[PDB]
Structure formats: structure tokens, C-alpha cells
């Protein structure tokens, strides 16, 4: 119950114009109103002197304390609920599972079923707190259309959940245009408002971008636009405190495997887990740096009833 | 009857310029108009402020719902009609046949008659819904010119269909230039508009590319151009919801068999089935990962009257 | 005990208005009152004739001597207490550690754990003068939220300090808006007044700026605003004489690795150490020019209990 009910603010010019400001593309949550810069406050059809101060001062979501709260975060950070891999080995290498309030990626190759791996968690997300789940509704928002509800139905059987219930609990977009990607997120923001939505697979986030822009070296701007989309996801992170696990594509360096797709503005915070497919049905997935464990490795195999333990 | 009749939109500036926008290289289907990014909307001689908003807003093909429709896809995906191999074994390994609305490939070697195997389905495509067919007219658009209508005529006899009718139902291009490949697709788009065309063998799609470009290491750009062509095929996928089965060439790794021809931008979604020719007349064809079955194998032999069952 | 107790000035119009002038956004320390330009003195709601003269003349913090004190600085500069790296090698390359009364930066790539490296010192800062510490409370004020108190707790074990005490000693902000960055600093200024706060990791200082402004070439002004923020940090430097270590992001030059993020107005004063990650767990960090040693290099590896020595 993170959000301070969108425009919880009673006043500070809450009369129609401010409500229209929220009713605009502008994010509606308390956090959004508060987090925003003045550029953005004066971005769209509101009176800059009065509005900014009023809105900014008014929220006092604190926000202000900022550099306050020395090792109080330790009392908090501990409380952050960390999701469940479904390989015992996987979870050990994750050291507490894939985590909410971080944008966490996977550096996959071809054939490596990272598509497959991601779709699986989107089921565990549904499970109770004590069974390693987030007891929330769930975003997989796919740009390849790598989406098989059929495979997800198998996961239900494995983890003892009512099929039709589980499928109804998480919801999905094919969204082709590079601009559409940006667009989609804003309405998620709206969708996030209405109930507790828990964990999110944009998949792959890079893939719609790979092509359909990147005509050689008019790329300065490509990488600019990704930023915007990437910052928004971090905005989405703070707002609702939802897990964002975003899928990448490695693209060869021919001077093997490769760097994760499109390089530099994939920023430090987004914690990144790379999958490298191996002997027989087994596949191996070895965390590149996050803060977690400074590094580490570990295999596992995809199983008809979900990505699981190295057992045959 | 997927397409919303090209420019179904009555207005939103439909006056001559918009019609000329569609009458341009720009795709004409409702989906095309809607799917496109603004880069592309502002790609060619239209006024960016007015046009984009008008066209984009107007379509409302929804499009917008995107992350909506939680396990509603299950009600839909089920309805997707999945084509017929003609080896009972083949179909069992396919677990419902080669599927429409996906770009599905085959990783063939030399002598492996994958050329042959592909031409066969292009007949079953013609068959009624209940006999495993798609009741659609059909694209084989070959760059090797590996095209024998004679062999296809044999398939008719096997599957009890009127010869001259069947041959008239599917149609073919030799198209030599790497640029011609891209070009050809756009007019298909036009050809797709005019009637229900069902399943498509571009064959081999890589082969015209293999040479006639790839002068060593000015390949960054080779792999770029393939992308464009590959994205367009996925665009063609959404548009008409037609099966795209694209044929590859294996190319040795001398460090056996081999990786499918030109590597990385062959993307996860395109589901890939590899053929490996074997004892006597028999040949074996063992699905590399798609979502279908996480993996699995199975032989079969080419028979004078089509690719068939392992029976002698 | 650098600060002359904010408004140490007994008179010089200290009656209510001057106190309100200090009680304003305007910095409160003796140094702030003194250092300020008249533009800024006449910036906010004071009488320009009387106020300026009174305040300016009154401080006489000397200030005035300026070009005085020929190599007396040598008697002083020597006394400046210089913090402790925790790699013996690191400290040798630093030639006395990361230094207070300078804004010192680190030019990091992805995966290079500079995030990690910075969080570590924020512990040594706590240590006694003789053990290489600053015996002060500490600012890490993070914009990525790259903050793991958990990892910091490990540092305590390594350097034999009471866990809960150490964590209570240093304090942290996630602060998203580009304008918020500027805002946060002013209250630090207030927080700096109240006790001896010793060393400061703004982290990364560039990263909130990377995006969320820099829409192409309305950038002249971006770089202006950074200046302001950067000058304030130098203002903060003189005031309390506290170490400012600010983390950067390298941003590729595609005409490798890269220039530090956002170019020109990163000024000469900020002494800069760039980290370049290497063989296995090891990482190498090779001082770009400051005055220190005109250049030089040196590796080291991250160790579960802190960034440390080349030992296995």
C-alpha cells in the first residue's frame, strides 16, 4: 500500500486545474507528483510560479529528509520482499531471489529459453508471501510476442495453484513500435494505481529497439530515447515498489558470447543475471555484477513443469 | 478476415494526403497504420504535428489495451489454426504442426532436401480446415530458384486435390539482389491485402544474403539490413496473421554440423526446426528450442509423393 | 571546528533582518556569509546599500589577506587529513588517500563496482585519525539508489568496528529530480552546521543528469545548471572542509572506453581516478591527472569484506 492514493493532497490548488494536471499524461501517484522536476512541472499548461511551489511544498512526502535516516534503511531494506526462483540452486545464486524496487535484467543468448525463464516467474509472483510469492497481479509486456500461456499453465500444476485463477491474475501486451514502448508504460502507471500489481516482465525490452531505429550512427538519439524509457521504469519502481525484470539480447563483439544489447545506458542499479546454455537439456546462469554477491555462477535445467533443479 | 480493410478509417484527414500516405510505400492495412512508429510516420512527406496524432489516435485498433486481456489470450491463442506436416511423426514432433502468426525457420544442411520439404507444405496449405489445411492462397518466394512445380504436382495426387486448381492457388518469385528481397516483401503486403493468402515459404531467406554482401567484416551492416527485413516479416505476421516459414543454411564452425547461417539477429520468437540427413532414403528433423516442447527429435523419409512417414 | 559558528557576528545589523537573511535559503556559516558575491547578497529581500557593506565589512574572516601568506599554506596544507583506501596498493597510487577540501571524482564503466568502491570508504571515514579515518559522520547521497547497507556492514567486520554504531554514524538519500539534487545540497549545508560531518559520497552525481534533461541540444543550459550545483559543492568544500567524492558515468565516443559523462564543465579542481575492470575478480584503477603524481596506474580486487589487495 505504498502509493499515497494518487492525489491524496486535499488542497494546494486541487481545484480542477491540478486534478487536470494529474488527469494529464503526468503521473498521478503521490510519489510521481513529488518526484518530478520543475522542467516537467512546467512541462504542460500549469502556472509555473504558484503551481510548482504549491505542489512541491504540499506533498512533503519527505522527500526532504533525504540524507536523513542513517542506517534506518537497514530497518526498512530488510522488510523488502524478494521473489522466488524455483530452482533451489537458482535461489542460492540469487541469495534471496529476484528483488522488487530494482530494475533487474537477464543478458540471454539464442536458444537459451530466457523468454521461457522469465514467463515462469510470472507465475511464482502469484504465490503467498510464505510460499515465496508476492500475492500481486502481474505485468508481462512482451515485444517479441514470445508468450505461451500454455507453458504458464504447466507452472500452475507444479506449484499447486488454480489454473484459471492464476491466468486471470497476470496480463499481457504485444507492443510493436519503439515509441509504443514508451507509451505503454504510462497506462501501466494507470493500471498500477487501481490495484496492487506485483512483478513485471517487460520482455525483451531491448528487442523492439534493436532494429526499427538503429540505422547505423543516428544512434545518439536511440540511446537517448532508451534512457527516457529506462528512467521511467525506475520512476515506476519507486512509485509502486514493483519488481521490474526486463529481458536483454547479447549481440556479438567481432574483433566469444557478447555484451548485453546496445551497451552504455544500461546503468549500474539494474542488477543483471546472464544465462549460457549447456550440456543436453541443462542451461547455466551466472550473475554478472550487482551488489548482491560481488560475483558467482550455477547450473539448472528447463523442465516441462518449469525451470528447475539440476535433477534429471 | 484479420485486416480492418486497409484505410477503414473514414476520416482523421483521410482526404487525399492520408490516402497518398497509404498509397505510398507505407503499409496500407489498419494494423500497419497503427503499428508504425512516429519516426516512420514522419518518415515521408506528411505534417508531423497534425498527422501523427490524428492517425495514431484515430486507429484505436486497441493497440491501447496492450497490457490488458489477462489470460484472454488463452481464449484466443487456442483459435490460431496450425498447419499440417504430412508425416504423422513430423506432426507429433511439431505438436500441432507449423504455426501461423509466428515466423518459423528450418536449419538445413546440403543434400537434406529442406528445399523439397518446404515445397511440400505449400500444397497442404491449400487443404480444408478439417483436413489440416489453411484454405488460403500461398507465397513461396525462392531465392535459390529451388522451385519444382512438378514435385508439387505429386503432392496433389497424394492429398486428392485438383491439380491445376492447386497450382493456381500458390505463386512464386526468383528474386536475386539482397535489396530486391526487402523490395519484394512490400508488394506482398499489397498482394496480401487483396485476398486471404495463408502460408508462406520464403526459401532460403538467408541464402541470397550469404554472399552478395558479406565481404568479410563490413558485416555490421549486413546483420543490420537482415534485421530490417526480418522485422518487416514480423510486421507481415501481425498484418495478415499468415504463416511465415523461412529456410536457413548451416555454416560450419571450424574450431560437427553447424550454427544456423549468419547467427545473432535470428531472434528468439521465430521457432526453429533443424533437418539432419541419415540412413538410406530417410532423413531426421529435431526441433531446436521454440516454446512448443522445451526440446525433442524424430525421423521420417522423403517419398516420391511427398515428405512422409518412416514406413518403407 | 572550521565553521565560525554560523552567525558568529554579534552585531553588524544582526537585528532580526540579518538573522532572517541567514534564516533564508542563504548559507548560514561564517564562510558562506563572507564568500558570497553581492549579486547574491542583493539576490533576496535585503537593503542593498546598508546590507552589503555591513555584512561584507563585518565578516573580516580575512578573506582579505588572500594574496598574503606566501608558503604559509605549506604549514597548513600539510595539516589537511587525507582519508584511507583499504587497498595498500590503492593508497600508494592515491599517495595519501582520497583528500578532504577537494571535490574528488571516479570515471567508472558498467560492472566496474565504483558504486561498491565508493560505499566502502564511507565506512573508513568513521575510523580514528591514527587508523586512517576522519572521525566524522557521513553523507552518501545516492541518485541511482545503488545503496547496500548490508555490504557496508561487511566493512565493519573487516575494520573491527561496532556495527550498529557505524551504520548510525553515516546517512542517505535517494533523490530523483535534477532540481532535487540542487535542493538536497542546501539542507546538507544545514545538516553540516549542526555537527562535524567528514566525508561525502554523492553517487553518481552525473547519473540523475544523464537523462531527465538532456534532450539533445537544449544542453547549453543543462551544462549551466550542473555548474551551479558543482560550484555549490565547492562552496560546501570551503565551508566545512569536508571530503566530496562524486561518482561519474563514462559515455562512449563512437567516432575504446569513454570520457567522463557530460564533458567540459567537469573542472580542473575535482581530482579524478578512473576504474577499468579486468581479469577475473580483479579490477584496475588508474588516476587521470590531478596535481598529486602527474599520472600513474595499479590493480586490486573487490573482496567480499571490502575493496582490497591484489591477494587471492
Numbering used by the authors:
A (entry chain C): 644 to 955
B (entry chain D): 956 to 1267
C (entry chain B): 332 to 643
From the paper:
The abundant ssDNA-binding protein, replication protein A, transiently engages the single-stranded 3′ tail, but is replaced by RAD51, whose nucleation on ssDNA is stabilized by the evolutionarily conserved BRC repeat motifs within the BRCA2 tumour suppressor protein. Protomers of RAD51 and its orthologues share a structurally conserved, ATP-binding core catalytic domain. ATP hydrolysis by the catalytic activity of RAD51 allows the components of the repair reaction to dissociate.
Here, we have used electron cryo-microscopy followed by an image processing technique that couples maximum likelihood single particle processing methods with helical symmetry software to calculate a three-dimensional (3D) model of the human RAD51 presynaptic filament to a near-atomic resolution of 3.5–5Å, revealing previously unrecognized structural features. The helical pitch of 80% of the filaments lies between 95 and 110Å, with an average of 103Å. The overall architecture of the human RAD51 presynaptic filament with 6 protomers docked into the EM map when viewed perpendicular or longitudinal to the filament axis reveals that like RecA, human RAD51 protomers form a chain that encases ssDNA as a 1-start helix to create the presynaptic filament. The angular displacement (twist) between protomers in the presynaptic RAD51 filament is constant at 56.2°, encompassing 6.4 protomers per turn of the helix. ssDNA (red ribbon) lies between the inner surface of the protomers and the filament axis. When viewed top-down along the filament axis, the N-terminal regions are positioned peripherally relative to ssDNA (red ribbon), suggesting that they do not participate in RAD51–DNA interactions as previously proposed. The fitting suggested that, just as in the RecA filament, the presynaptic human RAD51 filament engages the ssDNA backbone, exposing the nucleotide bases for homologous pairing reactions. ssDNA within our fitted model for the presynaptic filament lies close to the filament axis, and most likely binds the inner surface of RAD51 protomers via the L1 and L2 loop regions which encircle it, with each protomer making three contacts with ssDNA. Moreover, our model with fitted ssDNA suggests a stoichiometry of three nucleotides per RAD51 protomer in a filament with pitch 103Å, incorporating 6.4 protomers per turn. We also carried out 3D classification and refinement with imposed dimer symmetry; again, no observable widening of the α-helices was detected.
